């Protein structure tokens, strides 16, 4: 067995040490005992590997010297904290596979090395300790964006405007339920926290508060569903989306579009959903009048997606749905022949309204639909290749005996293939 023993430790320092030690022990695959007193901590581990033993020793030393009232001990703590942070930040580099994430990681490490405050340093360490475990590089983007935002806003010369922006942004991030919104808020906040331009700060603070207004209105509309008050709130959401397009900060309009789409998807056939589709059309028209391409294409995309969901619900059939940057795909399964005819009939009935490029593929008892806009003729012909390949892969896998859960997985692997063939 291996043992550690930690004298004169203050309770807040004690409430740190075990957390980090446990995470290392759970990384190394070893059992642990811990015991606590007023002023003392004792720990024992099954046959701990020397590399982890040295890292735990480094952390224990750092904890004592971070508590110590001596300025030279606190300086040595800043050094050991930044040293451990730098090793963890380096450990993330090979694991991560997106260059913007690698940029964010290197920036976080640099911001921490510039930071005067051990508590900032420790939360940056906490973010990196989450990132190293994290399964999704997009969650790593959220984590590192939050890390960067915390560090860059917490700086020793930071204006209260920057602190207010960070507080608004992080509160919005904590309140939100869709990761895409969290990204769009945090990214704008990070760009503000990196900058010194008071116009960028002002624009971002208004934009974050306009996102907050959108988030709050969606909470009100949702929780008060089945009412004239919710029906009134739909109009107000759409009108803030229109104001966002009139101002041109159209990333928040992307938020508002998605918020309306959630409401519409969550309450099929309702008067609310009936208001939402009509709103989404005016928002698309407003986005076309303002030339905001990806946003306008997103409005078209969401409209068509609602329509196939509505067709599916009216047919009462199984479907699967996934999304991408400039296209949508919906896969229908077990569709009865008269419903194959009727779905085809309705896809045209949608298409001749919305003006989209659209492709439909029929194989076995599966139909794959793909919709795309703004892309070139050649990109559309490659998308035509992809949807045909998606139908081939799905039906040949189902012919090979792929279960429902295996086809549900396969759409993720095909969505990745569709990025890999880019």
């Amino acid at each position: 067995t291996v043992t550690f023993d930690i004298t004169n430790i203050d309770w807040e320092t004690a409430e740190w040490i075990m957390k980090h030690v446990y995470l290392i022990a759970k990384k190394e695959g070893t059992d642990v005992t811990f015991s606590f007193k007023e002023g003392e901590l004792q720990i024992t581990v099954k046959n701990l590997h020397e590399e982890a033993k040295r890292e735990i020793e480094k952390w224990i030393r750092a904890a004592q010297l971070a508590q110590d009232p001596d300025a030279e001990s606190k300086a040595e703590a800043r050094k050991i904290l930044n040293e451990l942070i730098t090793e963890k930040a380096e450990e993330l580099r090979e694991k991560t596979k997106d260059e913007e994430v690698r940029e964010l990681a290197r920036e976080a490490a640099r911001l921490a090395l510039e930071s005067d405050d051990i508590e900032v340093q420790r939360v940056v360490l906490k973010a990196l300790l989450a990132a190293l475990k994290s399964k999704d590089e997009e969650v790593i983007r959220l984590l590192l964006l939050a890390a960067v935002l915390a560090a860059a806003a917490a700086r020793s010369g930071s204006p209260e405007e920057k602190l207010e922006i960070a507080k608004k942004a992080l509160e919005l991030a904590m309140k939100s339920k869709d990761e895409e919104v969290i990204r769009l808020a945090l990214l704008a906040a990070v760009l503000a926290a990196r900058s010194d331009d008071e116009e960028v700060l002002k624009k971002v603070k208004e934009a974050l508060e306009k996102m907050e207004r959108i988030m709050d209105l969606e909470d009100v509309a949702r929780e008060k569903s089945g009412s004239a008050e919710a029906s009134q709130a739909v109009k107000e959401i759409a009108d803030i989306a229109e104001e966002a397009l009139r101002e041109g900060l159209c990333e928040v309009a992307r938020v508002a579009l998605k918020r309306l789409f959630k409401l519409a998807k969550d309450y099929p056939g309702s008067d609310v959903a009936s208001l939402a589709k009509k709103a989404l059309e005016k928002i698309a028209e407003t986005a076309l009048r303002n030339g905001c391409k990806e946003t306008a294409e997103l409005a078209k995309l969401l409209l068509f997606l609602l329509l196939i969901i509505e067709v599916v619900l009216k047919m009462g059939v199984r479907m699967l749905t996934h999304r991408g940057g400039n296209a949508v795909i919906v896969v229908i399964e077990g569709l009865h022949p008269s419903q194959i005819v009727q779905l085809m009939q309705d896809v045209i009935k949608a298409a001749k309204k919305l003006g989209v490029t659209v492709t439909i593929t029929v194989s076995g008892d599966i139909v794959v639909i793909m919709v795309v806009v703004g892309a070139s003729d050649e990109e559309q012909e490659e998308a035509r290749r992809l949807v045909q390949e998606i139908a081939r892969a799905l039906q040949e896998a189902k012919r090979k005996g792929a279960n429902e859960e295996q086809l549900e997985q396969l759409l993720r692997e095909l969505l990745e293939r569709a990025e890999r063939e880019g």
Partner: peptide
């Protein structure tokens, strides 16, 4: 300085809580 030191602690705590929120669904 005091109001900024409190706001910084609020940011840090909010960030810890957000790191937990981002982790706990995983």
């Amino acid at each position: 300085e005091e109001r900024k030191k409190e706001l910084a602690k609020e940011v840090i705590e909010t960030a810890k809580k957000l790191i937990e929120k981002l982790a706990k669904e995983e």
